[PDB]
Write a protein that binds this ligand. Sequence first.
Ligand SMILES: N[C@@]1(C(=O)O)CNC[C@@H]1CCC[B-](O)(O)O
Ligand SMILES: N[C@@]1(C(=O)O)CNC[C@@H]1CCC[B-](O)(O)O
Ligand SMILES: N[C@@]1(C(=O)O)CNC[C@@H]1CCC[B-](O)(O)O
Ligand SMILES: [Mn+2]
Ligand SMILES: [Mn+2]
Ligand SMILES: [Mn+2]
Ligand SMILES: [Mn+2]
Ligand SMILES: [Mn+2]
Ligand SMILES: [Mn+2]
Lengths: 306, 306, 306
Amino acid sequence: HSVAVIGAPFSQGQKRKGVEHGPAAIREAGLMKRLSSLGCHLKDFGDLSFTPVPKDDLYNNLIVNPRSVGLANQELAEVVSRAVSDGYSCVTLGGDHSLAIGTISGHARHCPDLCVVWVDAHADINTPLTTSSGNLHGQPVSFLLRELQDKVPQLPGFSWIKPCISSASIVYIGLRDVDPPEHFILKNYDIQYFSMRDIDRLGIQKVMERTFDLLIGKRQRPIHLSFDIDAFDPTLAPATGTPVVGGLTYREGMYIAEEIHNTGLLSALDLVEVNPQLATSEEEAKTTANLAVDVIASSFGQTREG
Amino acid sequence: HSVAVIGAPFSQGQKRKGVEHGPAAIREAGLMKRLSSLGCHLKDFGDLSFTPVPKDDLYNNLIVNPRSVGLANQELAEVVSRAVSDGYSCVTLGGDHSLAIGTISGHARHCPDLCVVWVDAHADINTPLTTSSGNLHGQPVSFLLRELQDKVPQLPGFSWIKPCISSASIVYIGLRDVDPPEHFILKNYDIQYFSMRDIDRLGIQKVMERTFDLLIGKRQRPIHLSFDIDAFDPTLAPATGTPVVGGLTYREGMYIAEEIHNTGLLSALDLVEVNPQLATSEEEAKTTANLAVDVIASSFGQTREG
Amino acid sequence: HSVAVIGAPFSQGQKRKGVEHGPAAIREAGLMKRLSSLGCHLKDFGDLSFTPVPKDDLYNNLIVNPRSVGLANQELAEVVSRAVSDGYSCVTLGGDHSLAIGTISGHARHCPDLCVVWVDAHADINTPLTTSSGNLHGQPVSFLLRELQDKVPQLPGFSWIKPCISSASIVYIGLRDVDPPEHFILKNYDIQYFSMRDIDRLGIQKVMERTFDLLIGKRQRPIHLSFDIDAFDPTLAPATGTPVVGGLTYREGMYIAEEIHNTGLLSALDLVEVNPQLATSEEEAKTTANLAVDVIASSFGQTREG
Ligand SMILES: N[C@@]1(C(=O)O)CNC[C@@H]1CCC[B-](O)(O)O
Ligand SMILES: N[C@@]1(C(=O)O)CNC[C@@H]1CCC[B-](O)(O)O
Ligand SMILES: N[C@@]1(C(=O)O)CNC[C@@H]1CCC[B-](O)(O)O
Ligand SMILES: [Mn+2]
Ligand SMILES: [Mn+2]
Ligand SMILES: [Mn+2]
Ligand SMILES: [Mn+2]
Ligand SMILES: [Mn+2]
Ligand SMILES: [Mn+2]
């Protein structure tokens, strides 16, 4: 069993400095030794260096860094595609969540029937026409879903992106901070999600059961786990850019990762939005990074009963 | 779709200074804008000034400030009754919980078939003969329940009170610090409650289902939500006079408010016992006040899924 | 009902200084008054002074203080046996968990059909041949289970110990940090346990129901509750030697204890591994001690509804 680890130190999907140090923080929290201990054969691609784009002016006087986000994701997609083709499950360390454009596009290149479990406080599904921030880390899903493309204009640097995945092939877990246009999109296209309220009602066990029934109930499919650290309650993951009270507990996050592992289908994992500079203390940064490692390790078989 | 906001900066139901700054603290945490954003048409009555009573000696060498508490609640009931009479859902910001004598009396004056959801670590149902503290914020329910009245002596300043609500019309949620005579009262009058232990067993979804079955399962009734901030765990609401370990989580609190909103029957709400002076830090004070705003906003339609 | 309280200030089942002050910390947090208030008639045995053993060299160049742990547990077992013989429910305050060798042996002497509820982040079931630490507080169960005795070598100071419990007669709750050889032992001898993951799935009410079904579903048996304070999440019980993230909540711990009390069969209880010196602050030490008192008190009838 082989795992590729890719550092994607990208910050231009949003405006807060420091998320580009996420990959180093996660590495320094002991990721590689944790993965080896589970028996993973590891290939470390290091931290990628993304080609900058000169004069990357705002798109439509609103969307920030469109060409840089587009080119960095193009280059990342190529690495992910290559790594999956050589048989690695792909761990990508962010960096802001706009990198999912690249990891999912690269993943889907030769696994077009993949499915997506998006663990996040946010739906990240604004389009360039609905985003009120202009930050591409809050729009990545809009570029990936086939049903949405008549409503998604073409951004400079984005022409290489072919929407691959159907709206029936992504399930959200942990939502609690959704813009009204995103809520409209989720309803209008019948995208399935389990908000914190649904977890409050159902419990995380039934949530995972219904997630896998929706996605792999009829056939086995490679799973793409896109895990935004801010799905966890801010008391557990303070060092992140958009913290929202009322998040997953530690045990709930582990349970999600455990069930991901238990399918046997995990093919790529994003761990994004760890920003150590937003911690008010070194300890706050380290617990956030330590939590990111716990998620990744549990997703590749670390158990709580030994 | 109209909401009145009444500040009741009362502290004489108990002995700790500062709870009279609850209303200002909750307002400064952004309450009015949050209510407006939901579509509430707002009438702000400001903070009331209550008439002092000269020589308000202890009653029976035990009950403190009886006439002041009686008169303040008489005046508050007057304001609540006119606001409900003019079509407003009434939000009253405390202040100690003795002001529920006034808000429920004033509410019932216009809506006599109301029912009460009392969210609290405490039962607040001591009578003047069972209280061991003498503080009227630990007795408000005893003055309101019709079946208890033969055991409730008449206090100076209380003769205006018409206790007509039945013991079958109030349900408690969150109990975990109950005096032995309060436990006797709850059992002897078959008053229904969901303690923290019941929530542990049933889960908050079934707690709310069973609460509404008891109160509105036979007919629609206006709902009075009386919410003591100390129902929440002290880690979440530290700035309060009688914190008790092992309380509601944030998510459980939001879920209660959400189900209150979902009935469509919320007619008045109390948010009581925020005392910002008991915070050990400005952070603890603001967290408690922000939590209070979250409870109120969720009770009037704020969702976690947008 | 009569309760004996035995301080067992023992630290040589492990290497960290200060767990011998656990009994004094728990007493200072009000234990005796809490138990009296529940109506329990109290016999206080004080803190035992265990006989030292000169030249207590490592066994097999690994196992630390074997003769001291053997002899202290022999002396403790004698005291527990006498107290249980005299009709006391036995509360033993630790001290590290190697003292369960003594309390369970003494308890089993008069009550051979006793069953064991072991509440703990750890399984404590390494043998002298599987421990990687050499610390006897991580091995006590191996000396007590009949089915394991052909694989447990005899230690200096241990020859008095007769395995008294069958592997069907112990249930674990709270496991989350299990060594591979312990996991093998648990599965190979079909020892029943509820890990944190099981609690996440079932909820603590179902966990307790199944616990008692396994243990006393056929017949009434005296219950021995061996409660390692590190079963609780470290945010709640920080002053302990091997804290593990993702533990019991406060409410779950109270619920376990309440259900223990509700059987009416509690005959002895260990409250072990409070180490006040590992607190980074006086408050951290006191919160841990207060929690220990809450466990013991709820195990003997303290309720959350009064
Ligand atoms: N909907 C928002 C947006 O900007 O589109 C409005 N504010 C935050 C949220 C984006 C969160 C980005 B994520 O952290 O989840 O990668
Ligand atoms: N039962 C008590 C009483 O004084 O009657 C004994 N101690 C506090 C409790 C009252 C709590 C008042 B509430 O905060 O719930 O408004
Ligand atoms: N399995 C271990 C061992 O040393 O055997 C490895 N690390 C700690 C654990 C013992 C915990 C002892 B307890 O605290 O539960 O009394
Ligand atoms: Mn997010
Ligand atoms: Mn995201
Ligand atoms: Mn209260
Ligand atoms: Mn109250
Ligand atoms: Mn132990
Ligand atoms: Mn332990």
